[PDB]
Amino acid sequence: KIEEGKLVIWINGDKGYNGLAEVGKKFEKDTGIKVTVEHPDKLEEKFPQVAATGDGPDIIFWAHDRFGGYAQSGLLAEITPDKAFQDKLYPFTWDAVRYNGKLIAYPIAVEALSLIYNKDLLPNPPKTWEEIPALDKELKAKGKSALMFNLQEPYFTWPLIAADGGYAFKYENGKYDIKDVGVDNAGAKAGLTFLVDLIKNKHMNADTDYSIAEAAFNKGETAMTINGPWAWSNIDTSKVNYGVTVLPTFKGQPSKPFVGVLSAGINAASPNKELAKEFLENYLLTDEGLEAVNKDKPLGAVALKSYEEELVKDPRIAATMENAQKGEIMPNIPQMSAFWYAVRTAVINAASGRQTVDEALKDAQTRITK
Ligand SMILES: OC[C@H]1O[C@H](O[C@H]2[C@H](O)[C@@H](O)[C@@H](O)O[C@@H]2CO)[C@H](O)[C@@H](O)[C@@H]1O
């Protein structure tokens, strides 16, 4: 199951698992408790299965969106931070990790997609999406692509879809409407249609995924990429002169990236809940622990106020927060998994041409409602 006396931690590969392992080494040096940090592939899907079995990580790291479904399943132990620690973290991050009136994960960092552009290839990033086709034509003349970003994951395409009116679920009266879904509305169709026109006009390739986009940007092949702060470390190693900026507007409206608070959830099956709480509150959710994770891969804005006051000074973090303000914090509700699956199918099918934009978004609407 979950072995006692040890912390097993699941965090995504793009995130700073090596820095988190450094925090775990500090935790071991102080407490005698080994912390093993693992980055299983598809961990957001894997943790529900193993946690339902009672196996799994002691601590699960993901964006909050997935923790509401976990808590509904009962996978997450209700975290019990005292009011002082909640004061240390930002209230909106706490709201992101609140599910059914209970805090079900520890917020670590706020992550929003930003437009990352190569300043040498692109001295000024386009302010609008509509500029990108002409910019791509000019760059293709130069042997370069204007924009390469992950098209397999709905999370990267979502800002374009949301910009003109697309939404996952209607939020009103402090309650998301699971029945009311905005992916097949006109604004979402406009965003997906623009993306598919970029693919059809060969400004973008439908097969482009996270690895291809990151490699193209880091090698200098593409002028722009859309990515979270975690990519900044690889761009820094690449030595590409890059800026992090607001996502381009679509139809005069800001791209709304779905805003994810990286969250640490304690497995309800874990016999190490006290050790996990100790690690997260006094080792991770501290300036030094967040610095260790951030140094491996930038976390974005951090839920911890004291570290974020230092982090906000970074222009890249400022762009992340600007894009987070323009975007919507994700709903953490259980329906969000189904929403992400349906939007993934819609974007992939529309990009490939397997389905029209309208057919894909209609199917996505039916599946996000279900
Ligand atoms: O693409 C759907 C996906 O979106 C979000 O996952 C993000 C995550 O928030 C980022 O930190 C980073 O890992 O990129 C991911 C997308 O590849 C949701 O958190 C996730 O549940 C959802 O499936």
UniProtKB/Swiss-Prot annotation:
It holds the Pfam family SBP_bac_1. GO terms for biological process: carbohydrate transport; cell chemotaxis; detection of maltose stimulus; DNA damage response; maltodextrin transmembrane transport; maltose transport. It is found in: Periplasm. InterPro entries: Maltose/Cyclodextrin-bd, SBP, SBP_1_CS. The keyword Transport applies. Induction: Induced by maltose and the transcriptional regulator MalT. Permanently repressed by cold shock in a PNPase-dependent fashion. Gene3D superfamilies: Periplasmic binding protein-like II. GO terms for cellular component: ATP-binding cassette (ABC) transporter complex; ATP-binding cassette (ABC) transporter complex, substrate-binding subunit-containing; maltose transport complex; membrane; outer membrane-bounded periplasmic space; periplasmic space. It comes from the Bacteria. Keywords: Periplasm, Signal, Sugar transport, Transport. GO terms for molecular function: carbohydrate transmembrane transporter activity; maltose binding. NCBIfam families: PRK09474.1. The complex is composed of two ATP-binding proteins (MalK), two transmembrane proteins (MalG and MalF) and a solute-binding protein (MalE). Part of the ABC transporter complex MalEFGK involved in maltose/maltodextrin import. Binds maltose and higher maltodextrins such as maltotriose. Belongs to the bacterial solute-binding protein 1 family. This is Maltose/maltodextrin-binding periplasmic protein. It comes from Escherichia coli (strain K12). The gene is malE.
